[PDB]
Design a protein around this nucleic acid. Structure first.
Ligand SMILES: Nc1ncnc2c1ncn2[C@@H]1O[C@H](COP(=O)(O)OP(=O)(O)O)[C@@H](O)[C@H]1O
Ligand SMILES: Nc1ncnc2c1ncn2[C@@H]1O[C@H](COP(=O)(O)OP(=O)(O)O)[C@@H](O)[C@H]1O
Ligand SMILES: Nc1ncnc2c1ncn2[C@@H]1O[C@H](COP(=O)(O)OP(=O)(O)O)[C@@H](O)[C@H]1O
Ligand SMILES: Nc1ncnc2c1ncn2[C@@H]1O[C@H](COP(=O)(O)OP(=O)(O)O)[C@@H](O)[C@H]1O
Ligand SMILES: Nc1ncnc2c1ncn2[C@@H]1O[C@H](COP(=O)(O)OP(=O)(O)O)[C@@H](O)[C@H]1O
Ligand SMILES: [Mg+2]
Ligand SMILES: [Mg+2]
Ligand SMILES: [Mg+2]
Lengths: 378, 378, 378, 378, 371
DNA sequence: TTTTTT
């Protein structure tokens, strides 16, 4: 029969082209589910799959006028839509899917069954994803300097590890976190270390979504956190200076449901899946709109008490009560952090903590007995 | 003469392609009506029906350029439009229509007269639609814990059942329902169970449809409520605070009308069909701009008075006067909801309730003796 | 010579295709003038007229690539434009034009003379257009309950009849009517009956047409009421609340003009012909920015006083002065309205009322005494 | 040599297609110059000039694909622009140019010299352009009623005649006339008479051209008033209200230049020729943004005094201050103007007035002493 | 082979098509560097140039699709852009250019090296470009009447001549001129004279260019000054009130730059080359955002002290202090102004003044001794 | 501002 239809049927039998509910046509090229709303990539898959089909078909898929016919046949056989990103314990890279339960790494068809549209952005190095490397020792030194293992810092370190490790789970979390500490403590260092580990599954969204009604008009500060594993918010100002807004309590309750309401510019889609692990990076203790039992259930605080200063104010910083350690400020850190040195070394630590803390079910618990207002209300 | 016109005529005689009043071309593929404003699906239908014509006609539909000719002929033969969704007592799925008055599943031509352009988005498996199941007992235990079967909570339970079961009828409901209660009481669990049950006939919007005006400029928060059978507008703020917009009474009055005025972006269609049951999962007592009988005859309140807590906070919850019974939290409940485990059991429960409350006429009644301001005006 | 040129000239000899001043190519299919700026309509008529040409010509029109050549010729032979909708007292249906003055129904070539570009959207049943019928008997009871035929409600009843019957004549009306009354008095029932009666010549818009500037940017709320014979703008909010926009004084003046300024999206046409009977379904008395004699001559108010109540709250309706009668609510009325039961009985009633007040000349008059502010100014 | 090139050259030899400085392609069909960016005017002309070519060149213009080739050649052959609408004392009609200074109606090729692109839209009849006729008597009575010939209404009647007769000359004016007066006085009747007299050369625009900056993207409210003789911007609101825009003094400077900017949707033509006679039908005297000495020289105001009252409210009008005559209303008058009964009578009256004020030089003079602010500044 | 490619190469070898840095293709048809971003004129140029090619090639350009193929080839072979409008001493017309250093009119290939994309809007006829004419005498009388040719107004007259004549030099200018006077003193008369003389190389703007930042929102008032040789800013309010925005120093310091940063509606090109002599006409004393030494080196002002009133108001205006001579309002003066009879004469005066003042170096010197 | 355009 029509031999340009047999090619389309054979290509479709591989389940390489899929139709999503949002109207996209996700394709499977180079071990990744890529999609582009502006230009479909079906003709890319048709040309890439050329080697699987027999020799009698390969000579015909080179002409673009035949590739267009094959794409037209394919688009008329995808009738139903499927579901995407339904596996929480899977981290999608640019060349496979890392399994978090047993720390495996599947590529090819083995990674095809997990339909994950998002990706980390970079490739996975099985040789660099090891616990025996000088990078791992350097990282373990940096982390222990930021958060020591002293018994005075026992719970605060386990909570920190839990919060950081929950940044790899593709499931909805029902608790915020507050990276609270004085200046020059490691919050922006932890943020940069985490961004170097996940990459594309990370946005440092604006502060405006703590004090603004995210309902009227456009708000791309919300539409960006669609399927993002981690969302970081900084810039908590003083609540006594002019412009002292209040962290809207009802707004905190909105960033806990699996679907957040908000649309981008020139768009009609109003619901965004909430896989984020929102971490508010603050320096001063936050002042809330109004405290109630519904608000105290979805907040955790990770205290930061360690100062990395230059040998000018070291003694003055030591005399201060806001810190507990006065370790020496290093300059090579920001060099080999933005340059992605401790990328896989931090990934191994995150996977280890994820195994230690959330194997059966991923869940974040509040710590309300840390904020003075909450302590008063308790 | 032209056989590509005979094919189009034969396809037209089957009454598989129809023209709607909005200008869409609804096709009939896989026992369900489908449409897409961006790209027509007539070619999909032409290629699909190919298995119902003789051999001399079944081979001509493989070439896309010969399919566009049939599509052009079909578009040129459709003159007069039709009206859709005229049957309120039917629930459409991806593979047929369930008749609620008899609880009978019709597939194929048996369910084609009921031109339902919407669907739940999943198949209907008749093996999970029975009482004899382990999942049904678990769902019964969950619901009887959220709303206990006592005698001080009998009218409330009946109102809750009526409100939940009204989400299957595709008619205009003239009441607004508030899910009022303290934190951790079962409101979001009910919302998620309803979403799993009715599937895609369920849209969650922001609160901007109650505090802003739905007339100026675009408003896809209202344009998305077209032909949807349930709407959730949860997370009401605290109107007792300073700077909280009250609920506009006129906005409440619009939402209980057969047609709601509101347009999407880049669109001129200004009218949308209101088949939705609007439920406001609130946490505080609502406050309105003005109170009058027209507002008092459109509001119903159902209360949640069962707190699900951990053993850690089990003691502070018993002294609270906002609860009637304290149960133990279930950490794994959320996992087997997003997996659609209690999906068809809840569907059977809703159908059973609809068979009991809304058989002759479907109607929702107000409960003015639940808001203190309404009680004063009573 | 050219077969297709002769085919195109023959179609133009039938005077079926026409060009209007607005730039629309109206065609004559199924005894009705139809126009649509996006769908292919000239090819539709070309395919439909096929059973007029001889056999040697009737076979070429089965190829879509040949039906576009004939359309291209027809679009080139049309030089001059014509004027449409110049008869005010003719009501067009989907299969003819009803003459209001005498009641004769023309179908076929006799209806081609009145170039009415709009239509009701359904056929005209001469069998149901009779005075003696069960539905006509129930409708009379419904109306006599909504507006009783007493002696203190005779001027109001005749004003209501005038306003309702004026929705059939396609001429500019220089007055706006307010359906005033407390809740549950029969206004929405009248609106639904009118919508079922006049069909497509009825558009419902928001109150943005009353309090906004209807001139800047796209505005499909004004662009949609082009040639519509009735425009309902319900849901007027309270004005006693500080924060409510008053009804703009000049908008009322602009809406009573033979041509309204406003354009839809993706278009340049800025003039819409005003045939509408604008009816505002309000609950409280309207408040304007400024009151002047230029505005009291453009406003009429008709009151609804019969209250339809449930047996429980019936007693409370006997002490409110806002009612003159307490009828018992019929729960099944809305079922047999959306099903188009009183469609032709109401049409007969509207025609009978029309040829009793508007036969010499159709004109509407204001009632300034029925509004407190105008009463003060007068 | 070529066959489809000689046809294009011959069509050019007839001087039927011309290019303007704005990029328009004006064609000559049916004794009139026409330009339309949407319709295929060049292809219509190619089909219509088919009889003036040799027999062998006539049989090729039947196929649309040959006509498109001829049109493509014609577009390439036109490399130079020509001046259009240079004669200001000529009035175009659907079938020829009428000379205002002399009075002879130039029909056919004799009207080709005066390249008048715009037209009135209706054929000119010399049997109705007569001086004496019952229609003329009725029109003269109506005009004398609207503006009485009394001694006080002498300096105002001639200004009214000047303003009305300036709408025939196709030259840029320098004043903005305000039809100031109370309600039911005659402004709308005068506007309707002028519209029915001058046909297509009349347009009505919104108040954006006065109270908004006309330089934001597309603005068809300005692109529509290109080469139009008269423009109406009626129904001005009150300015001494809690929130209301102003006349934007700077915006009046732009409306007197012959280079008004503003492009229609889907087009690039930004600058439009300004032959318009801006007339604002208002009820309250305008309030500008800033009053300067450059504004009193481009503003004229004519007062309307004669009241048209119903027999009922006639006594209340005889005591009103802003009225000089209480002549009875006429219901059967405003229905006849839309029937173009006084079309040619009003055209003859306008020509008679034109050959009384605008023969040597056409110029509009301002009347600044009428506005209170300018009177105080004097 | 591929005769169409040979046709494209032969057409391109004549430098009839050029590519601009802004991404537009400028063609050369009928003695004019035309361009149209929406509909390209390359096919018109191919059909026109058909005559200079051999008959074997010239017989193929009659088919509209061969022309499109050659156009595609031409657009493919234009890789690098060229610098246009590099000559400041040339005034472009609709059918030629004018050389002010020699006062010579160039037509045809004699004016193709001078790549002048913008034009004036009308053709040139040198027969009416001579002093020997009465309209010459009437216009010279008007000019000496608006600015007396005496010793009490010598420096003012020379600065007025310099500023008005600078409007022909197609280069950047670093001095903003102010026109100071009372009502009915001759500002708008000079404005209409300039608009009639030069035409398209002239844009009239509003007060907005002195009160708002030039890089917010879609603003053509920064983009419309592309290659324009004049900006006559009017509608300046009285600065002795409340709510009337004053003049910003940053605005003035920005307008005196060779390029201006500003993006039009639906466009990304923020750069616009500025060649405009900015003459702001005022009615009262100006006040700026700040007064410092960085500003008085770019601002010049001239005075007008002659007012015109009708013979009815002759004695009513013959007794005023703000003026010194009062003739009668001439209605016929404005008559042959939109008809543009007094167009080439004023052009001749401008050329004469340019030859008198701007031959060696083009430079405007500020006069901070009057404000 | 966005949306509308485009
Ligand atoms: N483990 C460490 N040992 C020594 N120096 C460190 C260590 N971690 C971070 N620093 C240095 O201290 C600084 C900490 O800054 P940081 O606390 O991230 O800023 P912020 O307080 O704004 O978040 C960094 O610039 C880094 O160079
Ligand atoms: N029988 C039960 N029914 C419903 N939820 C239960 C039950 N037992 C434990 N839970 C848990 O209690 C939690 C209640 O939270 P929820 O009521 O959804 O919050 P909200 O106050 O926003 O409605 C849920 O996460 C659920 O997993
Ligand atoms: N003539 C009638 N007889 C019996 N019931 C009626 C009649 N008219 C209306 N009803 C019922 O009473 C209710 C009136 O509500 P509605 O008229 O919509 O309120 P409103 O007038 O405020 O819009 C309707 O639901 C309708 O079913
Ligand atoms: N010459 C006339 N003789 C009698 N009635 C007239 C005359 N001119 C106008 N009318 C009446 O005046 C009415 C129009 O008033 P209109 O001009 O719309 O008021 P406004 O000036 O407030 O717009 C029409 O209904 C018409 O019948
Ligand atoms: N020197 C002059 N020669 C001829 N007419 C003049 C002269 N000065 C002023 N006028 C007259 O004054 C009017 C313009 O005055 P102008 O100073 O431009 O005020 P505005 O700027 O408000 O128009 C013109 O109509 C012109 O006839
Ligand atoms: Mg919740
Ligand atoms: Mg109602
Ligand atoms: Mg009027």
């Amino acid at each position: 029969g029509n031999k340009l239809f047999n090619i389309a049927q054979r290509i479709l039998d591989t389940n390489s082209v899929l139709l999503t509910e949002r109207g996209d046509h996700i394709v499977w090229i180079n071990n990744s589910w890529k999609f582009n709303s502006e230009e479909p990539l079906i003709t890319k898959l048709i040309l890439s799959i050329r080697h699987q089909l027999p020799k009698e078909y390969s000579s015909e898929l080179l002409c673009p006028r035949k590739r267009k016919t094959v794409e037209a046949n394919i688009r008329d056989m995808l009738v139903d839509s499927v579901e995407t990103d339904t596996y929480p314990d899977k981290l999608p890279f640019k060349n496979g899917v890392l399994d978090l339960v047993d720390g495996m790494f599947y590529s090819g068809d083995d990674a095809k069954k997990y339909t994950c549209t998002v990706s980390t952005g970079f490739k996975f190095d099985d040789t660099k994803f090891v616990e025996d490397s000088p990078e791992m020792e350097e990282l373990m030194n940096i982390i222990n300097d930021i958060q020591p293992l002293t018994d005075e810092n026992k719970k605060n370190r386990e909570l920190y590890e839990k919060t950081l490790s929950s940044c790899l789970c593709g499931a909805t979390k029902g608790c915020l976190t507050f990276f609270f500490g004085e200046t020059a403590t490691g919050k922006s260092t932890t943020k940069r270390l985490l961004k170097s580990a996940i990459g594309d599954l990370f946005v440092e969204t604006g502060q405006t979504i703590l004090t603004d009604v995210l309902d009227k008009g456009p708000n791309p500060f919300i539409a960006n956190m669609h399927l993002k594993r981690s969302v970081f918010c900084s810039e908590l100002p003083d609540f006594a200076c002019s412009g002292s807004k209040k962290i809207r309590s009802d707004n905190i309750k909105k960033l806990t449901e699996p679907c957040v309401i908000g649309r981008p510019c020139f768009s009609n889609k109003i619901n965004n899946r909430n896989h984020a692990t929102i971490i508010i990076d603050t320096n001063y203790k936050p002042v809330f709109d109004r405290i109630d039992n519904a608000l105290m259930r979805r907040i955790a605080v990770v205290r930061f008490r360690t100062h990395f200063s230059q040998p000018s104010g070291r003694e003055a910083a030591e005399n201060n009560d806001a810190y507990d350690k006065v370790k020496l400020l290093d300059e090579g850190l920001d060099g080999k952090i933005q340059n992605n040195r401790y990328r896989f070394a931090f990934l191994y630590l995150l996977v280890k903590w994820y195994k230690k803390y959330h194997i059966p079910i991923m869940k974040l618990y509040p710590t309300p007995e840390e904020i003075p207002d909450f302590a008063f209300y308790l």
